[PDB]
PDB file of all heavy atoms in Angstrom:
ATOM      1  N   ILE A1043       2.039   2.704  14.004  1.00  0.00           N
ATOM      2  CA  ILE A1043       2.343   3.675  15.048  1.00  0.00           C
ATOM      3  C   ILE A1043       3.845   3.703  15.281  1.00  0.00           C
ATOM      4  O   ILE A1043       4.548   2.710  15.069  1.00  0.00           O
ATOM      5  CB  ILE A1043       1.595   3.350  16.357  1.00  0.00           C
ATOM      6  CG1 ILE A1043       1.901   1.917  16.803  1.00  0.00           C
ATOM      7  CG2 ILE A1043       0.100   3.543  16.171  1.00  0.00           C
ATOM      8  CD1 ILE A1043       1.268   1.538  18.120  1.00  0.00           C
ATOM      9  N   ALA A1044       4.335   4.860  15.727  1.00  0.00           N
ATOM     10  CA  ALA A1044       5.745   5.035  16.069  1.00  0.00           C
ATOM     11  C   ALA A1044       5.914   4.687  17.542  1.00  0.00           C
ATOM     12  O   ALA A1044       5.771   5.533  18.426  1.00  0.00           O
ATOM     13  CB  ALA A1044       6.205   6.456  15.768  1.00  0.00           C
ATOM     14  N   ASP A1045       6.223   3.417  17.810  1.00  0.00           N
ATOM     15  CA  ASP A1045       6.367   2.970  19.192  1.00  0.00           C
ATOM     16  C   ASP A1045       7.550   3.646  19.874  1.00  0.00           C
ATOM     17  O   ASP A1045       7.474   3.991  21.059  1.00  0.00           O
ATOM     18  CB  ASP A1045       6.520   1.450  19.237  1.00  0.00           C
ATOM     19  CG  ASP A1045       5.260   0.725  18.805  1.00  0.00           C
ATOM     20  OD1 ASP A1045       4.157   1.278  19.000  1.00  0.00           O
ATOM     21  OD2 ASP A1045       5.372  -0.396  18.269  1.00  0.00           O
ATOM     22  N   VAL A1046       8.652   3.842  19.148  1.00  0.00           N
ATOM     23  CA  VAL A1046       9.861   4.427  19.705  1.00  0.00           C
ATOM     24  C   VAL A1046      10.379   5.496  18.753  1.00  0.00           C
ATOM     25  O   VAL A1046      10.115   5.474  17.549  1.00  0.00           O
ATOM     26  CB  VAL A1046      10.952   3.364  19.965  1.00  0.00           C
ATOM     27  CG1 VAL A1046      11.429   2.756  18.652  1.00  0.00           C
ATOM     28  CG2 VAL A1046      12.115   3.965  20.738  1.00  0.00           C
ATOM     29  N   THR A1047      11.126   6.441  19.316  1.00  0.00           N
ATOM     30  CA  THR A1047      11.759   7.497  18.538  1.00  0.00           C
ATOM     31  C   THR A1047      13.153   7.047  18.121  1.00  0.00           C
ATOM     32  O   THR A1047      13.945   6.598  18.955  1.00  0.00           O
ATOM     33  CB  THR A1047      11.837   8.801  19.339  1.00  0.00           C
ATOM     34  OG1 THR A1047      12.407   9.833  18.522  1.00  0.00           O
ATOM     35  CG2 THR A1047      12.685   8.632  20.597  1.00  0.00           C
ATOM     36  N   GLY A1048      13.441   7.154  16.833  1.00  0.00           N
ATOM     37  CA  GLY A1048      14.719   6.708  16.327  1.00  0.00           C
ATOM     38  C   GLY A1048      14.893   7.075  14.873  1.00  0.00           C
ATOM     39  O   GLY A1048      14.163   7.905  14.330  1.00  0.00           O
ATOM     40  N   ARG A1049      15.878   6.438  14.244  1.00  0.00           N
ATOM     41  CA  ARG A1049      16.179   6.645  12.832  1.00  0.00           C
ATOM     42  C   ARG A1049      15.434   5.585  12.028  1.00  0.00           C
ATOM     43  O   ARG A1049      15.790   4.403  12.067  1.00  0.00           O
ATOM     44  CB  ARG A1049      17.684   6.576  12.583  1.00  0.00           C
ATOM     45  CG  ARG A1049      18.080   6.662  11.117  1.00  0.00           C
ATOM     46  CD  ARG A1049      19.568   6.933  10.967  1.00  0.00           C
ATOM     47  NE  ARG A1049      20.379   5.998  11.738  1.00  0.00           N
ATOM     48  CZ  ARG A1049      21.698   6.064  11.847  1.00  0.00           C
ATOM     49  NH1 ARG A1049      22.397   7.012  11.243  1.00  0.00           N
ATOM     50  NH2 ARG A1049      22.335   5.158  12.583  1.00  0.00           N
ATOM     51  N   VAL A1050      14.400   6.010  11.302  1.00  0.00           N
ATOM     52  CA  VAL A1050      13.570   5.065  10.564  1.00  0.00           C
ATOM     53  C   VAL A1050      14.405   4.398   9.481  1.00  0.00           C
ATOM     54  O   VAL A1050      15.034   5.070   8.652  1.00  0.00           O
ATOM     55  CB  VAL A1050      12.341   5.772   9.972  1.00  0.00           C
ATOM     56  CG1 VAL A1050      12.752   6.779   8.909  1.00  0.00           C
ATOM     57  CG2 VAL A1050      11.368   4.752   9.397  1.00  0.00           C
ATOM     58  N   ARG A1051      14.420   3.065   9.488  1.00  0.00           N
ATOM     59  CA  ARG A1051      15.103   2.260   8.476  1.00  0.00           C
ATOM     60  C   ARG A1051      14.040   1.355   7.863  1.00  0.00           C
ATOM     61  O   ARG A1051      13.849   0.218   8.300  1.00  0.00           O
ATOM     62  CB  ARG A1051      16.254   1.463   9.079  1.00  0.00           C
ATOM     63  CG  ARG A1051      17.121   0.757   8.048  1.00  0.00           C
ATOM     64  CD  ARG A1051      18.169  -0.123   8.710  1.00  0.00           C
ATOM     65  NE  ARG A1051      17.566  -1.231   9.443  1.00  0.00           N
ATOM     66  CZ  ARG A1051      17.209  -2.387   8.899  1.00  0.00           C
ATOM     67  NH1 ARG A1051      17.371  -2.625   7.607  1.00  0.00           N
ATOM     68  NH2 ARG A1051      16.670  -3.326   9.670  1.00  0.00           N
ATOM     69  N   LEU A1052      13.351   1.866   6.848  1.00  0.00           N
ATOM     70  CA  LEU A1052      12.202   1.201   6.254  1.00  0.00           C
ATOM     71  C   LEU A1052      12.588   0.638   4.892  1.00  0.00           C
ATOM     72  O   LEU A1052      13.152   1.354   4.057  1.00  0.00           O
ATOM     73  CB  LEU A1052      11.029   2.178   6.121  1.00  0.00           C
ATOM     74  CG  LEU A1052       9.673   1.636   5.657  1.00  0.00           C
ATOM     75  CD1 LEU A1052       8.563   2.602   6.046  1.00  0.00           C
ATOM     76  CD2 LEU A1052       9.646   1.391   4.157  1.00  0.00           C
ATOM     77  N   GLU A1053      12.287  -0.638   4.677  1.00  0.00           N
ATOM     78  CA  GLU A1053      12.477  -1.295   3.389  1.00  0.00           C
ATOM     79  C   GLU A1053      11.101  -1.571   2.799  1.00  0.00           C
ATOM     80  O   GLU A1053      10.277  -2.251   3.422  1.00  0.00           O
ATOM     81  CB  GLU A1053      13.293  -2.583   3.527  1.00  0.00           C
ATOM     82  CG  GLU A1053      12.756  -3.605   4.524  1.00  0.00           C
ATOM     83  CD  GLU A1053      13.034  -3.230   5.968  1.00  0.00           C
ATOM     84  OE1 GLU A1053      13.488  -2.092   6.212  1.00  0.00           O
ATOM     85  OE2 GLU A1053      12.799  -4.075   6.857  1.00  0.00           O
ATOM     86  N   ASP A1054      10.850  -1.034   1.608  1.00  0.00           N
ATOM     87  CA  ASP A1054       9.510  -1.006   1.029  1.00  0.00           C
ATOM     88  C   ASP A1054       9.247  -2.312   0.289  1.00  0.00           C
ATOM     89  O   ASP A1054       9.762  -2.525  -0.815  1.00  0.00           O
ATOM     90  CB  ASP A1054       9.358   0.191   0.097  1.00  0.00           C
ATOM     91  CG  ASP A1054       9.608   1.510   0.801  1.00  0.00           C
ATOM     92  OD1 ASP A1054      10.771   1.780   1.165  1.00  0.00           O
ATOM     93  OD2 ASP A1054       8.640   2.277   0.990  1.00  0.00           O
ATOM     94  N   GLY A1055       8.444  -3.183   0.893  1.00  0.00           N
ATOM     95  CA  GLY A1055       7.971  -4.373   0.216  1.00  0.00           C
ATOM     96  C   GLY A1055       6.693  -4.088  -0.545  1.00  0.00           C
ATOM     97  O   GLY A1055       5.703  -3.643   0.043  1.00  0.00           O
ATOM     98  N   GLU A1056       6.699  -4.342  -1.856  1.00  0.00           N
ATOM     99  CA  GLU A1056       5.546  -3.983  -2.674  1.00  0.00           C
ATOM    100  C   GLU A1056       4.293  -4.736  -2.246  1.00  0.00           C
ATOM    101  O   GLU A1056       3.176  -4.262  -2.476  1.00  0.00           O
ATOM    102  CB  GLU A1056       5.848  -4.252  -4.150  1.00  0.00           C
ATOM    103  CG  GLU A1056       4.810  -3.683  -5.110  1.00  0.00           C
ATOM    104  CD  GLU A1056       4.746  -2.168  -5.075  1.00  0.00           C
ATOM    105  OE1 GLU A1056       5.640  -1.546  -4.462  1.00  0.00           O
ATOM    106  OE2 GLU A1056       3.802  -1.601  -5.661  1.00  0.00           O
ATOM    107  N   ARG A1057       4.432  -5.932  -1.639  1.00  0.00           N
ATOM    108  CA  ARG A1057       3.280  -6.760  -1.159  1.00  0.00           C
ATOM    109  C   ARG A1057       2.974  -6.419   0.306  1.00  0.00           C
ATOM    110  O   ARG A1057       1.789  -6.175   0.583  1.00  0.00           O
ATOM    111  CB  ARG A1057       3.579  -8.255  -1.338  1.00  0.00           C
ATOM    112  CG  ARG A1057       2.450  -9.202  -0.946  1.00  0.00           C
ATOM    113  CD  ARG A1057       1.120  -8.966  -1.651  1.00  0.00           C
ATOM    114  NE  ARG A1057       0.236  -8.044  -0.937  1.00  0.00           N
ATOM    115  CZ  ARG A1057      -0.850  -7.426  -1.426  1.00  0.00           C
ATOM    116  NH1 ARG A1057      -1.267  -7.618  -2.671  1.00  0.00           N
ATOM    117  NH2 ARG A1057      -1.532  -6.606  -0.638  1.00  0.00           N
ATOM    118  N   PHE A1058       3.965  -6.443   1.212  1.00  0.00           N
ATOM    119  CA  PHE A1058       3.811  -6.056   2.608  1.00  0.00           C
ATOM    120  C   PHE A1058       4.946  -5.113   2.973  1.00  0.00           C
ATOM    121  O   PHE A1058       6.119  -5.497   2.906  1.00  0.00           O
ATOM    122  CB  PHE A1058       3.818  -7.276   3.535  1.00  0.00           C
ATOM    123  CG  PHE A1058       2.785  -8.311   3.190  1.00  0.00           C
ATOM    124  CD1 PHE A1058       3.168  -9.569   2.755  1.00  0.00           C
ATOM    125  CD2 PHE A1058       1.434  -8.033   3.318  1.00  0.00           C
ATOM    126  CE1 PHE A1058       2.222 -10.528   2.442  1.00  0.00           C
ATOM    127  CE2 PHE A1058       0.485  -8.987   3.006  1.00  0.00           C
ATOM    128  CZ  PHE A1058       0.878 -10.236   2.568  1.00  0.00           C
ATOM    129  N   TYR A1059       4.604  -3.887   3.357  1.00  0.00           N
ATOM    130  CA  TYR A1059       5.616  -2.943   3.808  1.00  0.00           C
ATOM    131  C   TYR A1059       6.256  -3.447   5.095  1.00  0.00           C
ATOM    132  O   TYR A1059       5.561  -3.891   6.015  1.00  0.00           O
ATOM    133  CB  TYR A1059       5.000  -1.560   4.038  1.00  0.00           C
ATOM    134  CG  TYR A1059       4.558  -0.840   2.781  1.00  0.00           C
ATOM    135  CD1 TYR A1059       3.546   0.108   2.827  1.00  0.00           C
ATOM    136  CD2 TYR A1059       5.158  -1.095   1.554  1.00  0.00           C
ATOM    137  CE1 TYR A1059       3.136   0.775   1.688  1.00  0.00           C
ATOM    138  CE2 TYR A1059       4.756  -0.434   0.410  1.00  0.00           C
ATOM    139  CZ  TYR A1059       3.745   0.500   0.484  1.00  0.00           C
ATOM    140  OH  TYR A1059       3.340   1.162  -0.653  1.00  0.00           O
ATOM    141  N   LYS A1060       7.581  -3.380   5.154  1.00  0.00           N
ATOM    142  CA  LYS A1060       8.340  -3.734   6.347  1.00  0.00           C
ATOM    143  C   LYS A1060       9.018  -2.472   6.862  1.00  0.00           C
ATOM    144  O   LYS A1060       9.784  -1.834   6.131  1.00  0.00           O
ATOM    145  CB  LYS A1060       9.366  -4.826   6.041  1.00  0.00           C
ATOM    146  CG  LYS A1060      10.044  -5.415   7.270  1.00  0.00           C
ATOM    147  CD  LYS A1060       9.046  -6.114   8.181  1.00  0.00           C
ATOM    148  CE  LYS A1060       9.744  -6.863   9.303  1.00  0.00           C
ATOM    149  NZ  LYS A1060       8.772  -7.432  10.276  1.00  0.00           N
ATOM    150  N   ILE A1061       8.738  -2.119   8.113  1.00  0.00           N
ATOM    151  CA  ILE A1061       9.176  -0.856   8.696  1.00  0.00           C
ATOM    152  C   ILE A1061      10.006  -1.153   9.936  1.00  0.00           C
ATOM    153  O   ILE A1061       9.574  -1.909  10.814  1.00  0.00           O
ATOM    154  CB  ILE A1061       7.980   0.049   9.051  1.00  0.00           C
ATOM    155  CG1 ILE A1061       7.074   0.244   7.830  1.00  0.00           C
ATOM    156  CG2 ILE A1061       8.471   1.389   9.577  1.00  0.00           C
ATOM    157  CD1 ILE A1061       5.962  -0.779   7.716  1.00  0.00           C
ATOM    158  N   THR A1062      11.196  -0.559  10.001  1.00  0.00           N
ATOM    159  CA  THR A1062      12.062  -0.666  11.165  1.00  0.00           C
ATOM    160  C   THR A1062      12.652   0.704  11.462  1.00  0.00           C
ATOM    161  O   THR A1062      12.887   1.505  10.553  1.00  0.00           O
ATOM    162  CB  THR A1062      13.188  -1.686  10.947  1.00  0.00           C
ATOM    163  OG1 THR A1062      14.080  -1.211   9.930  1.00  0.00           O
ATOM    164  CG2 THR A1062      12.615  -3.030  10.522  1.00  0.00           C
ATOM    165  N   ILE A1063      12.887   0.969  12.745  1.00  0.00           N
ATOM    166  CA  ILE A1063      13.428   2.245  13.198  1.00  0.00           C
ATOM    167  C   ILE A1063      14.579   1.963  14.153  1.00  0.00           C
ATOM    168  O   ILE A1063      14.396   1.281  15.169  1.00  0.00           O
ATOM    169  CB  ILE A1063      12.356   3.118  13.878  1.00  0.00           C
ATOM    170  CG1 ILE A1063      12.910   4.509  14.186  1.00  0.00           C
ATOM    171  CG2 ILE A1063      11.854   2.458  15.153  1.00  0.00           C
ATOM    172  CD1 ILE A1063      11.894   5.439  14.802  1.00  0.00           C
ATOM    173  N   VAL A1064      15.760   2.481  13.828  1.00  0.00           N
ATOM    174  CA  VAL A1064      16.932   2.322  14.682  1.00  0.00           C
ATOM    175  C   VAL A1064      16.795   3.287  15.854  1.00  0.00           C
ATOM    176  O   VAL A1064      16.709   4.505  15.638  1.00  0.00           O
ATOM    177  CB  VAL A1064      18.233   2.579  13.906  1.00  0.00           C
ATOM    178  CG1 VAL A1064      19.442   2.343  14.800  1.00  0.00           C
ATOM    179  CG2 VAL A1064      18.306   1.697  12.668  1.00  0.00           C
ATOM    180  N   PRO A1065      16.771   2.810  17.098  1.00  0.00           N
ATOM    181  CA  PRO A1065      16.636   3.737  18.228  1.00  0.00           C
ATOM    182  C   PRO A1065      17.811   4.701  18.299  1.00  0.00           C
ATOM    183  O   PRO A1065      18.953   4.342  18.005  1.00  0.00           O
ATOM    184  CB  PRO A1065      16.587   2.810  19.448  1.00  0.00           C
ATOM    185  CG  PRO A1065      17.247   1.554  19.000  1.00  0.00           C
ATOM    186  CD  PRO A1065      16.921   1.415  17.548  1.00  0.00           C
ATOM    187  N   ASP A1066      17.518   5.941  18.692  1.00  0.00           N
ATOM    188  CA  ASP A1066      18.572   6.941  18.835  1.00  0.00           C
ATOM    189  C   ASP A1066      19.493   6.595  20.000  1.00  0.00           C
ATOM    190  O   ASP A1066      20.702   6.410  19.820  1.00  0.00           O
ATOM    191  CB  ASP A1066      17.957   8.329  19.027  1.00  0.00           C
ATOM    192  CG  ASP A1066      17.247   8.828  17.784  1.00  0.00           C
ATOM    193  OD1 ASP A1066      17.666   8.453  16.668  1.00  0.00           O
ATOM    194  OD2 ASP A1066      16.272   9.596  17.922  1.00  0.00           O
ATOM    195  N   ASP A1067      18.933   6.502  21.208  1.00  0.00           N
ATOM    196  CA  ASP A1067      19.748   6.173  22.373  1.00  0.00           C
ATOM    197  C   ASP A1067      20.355   4.780  22.246  1.00  0.00           C
ATOM    198  O   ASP A1067      21.528   4.573  22.575  1.00  0.00           O
ATOM    199  CB  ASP A1067      18.910   6.280  23.647  1.00  0.00           C
ATOM    200  CG  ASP A1067      17.665   5.414  23.599  1.00  0.00           C
ATOM    201  OD1 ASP A1067      17.101   5.243  22.499  1.00  0.00           O
ATOM    202  OD2 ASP A1067      17.252   4.905  24.662  1.00  0.00           O
TER     203      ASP A1067
END
Side-chain angles (χ1 to χ4, degrees):
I1043 55 177
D1045 293 331
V1046 65
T1047 183
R1049 175 166 51 184
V1050 66
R1051 188 185 65 85
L1052 187 160
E1053 55 284 9
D1054 301 70
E1056 190 64 11
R1057 183 56 269 165
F1058 304 115
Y1059 291 154
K1060 189 63 172 174
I1061 306 91
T1062 67
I1063 187 178
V1064 183
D1066 292 330
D1067 56 327

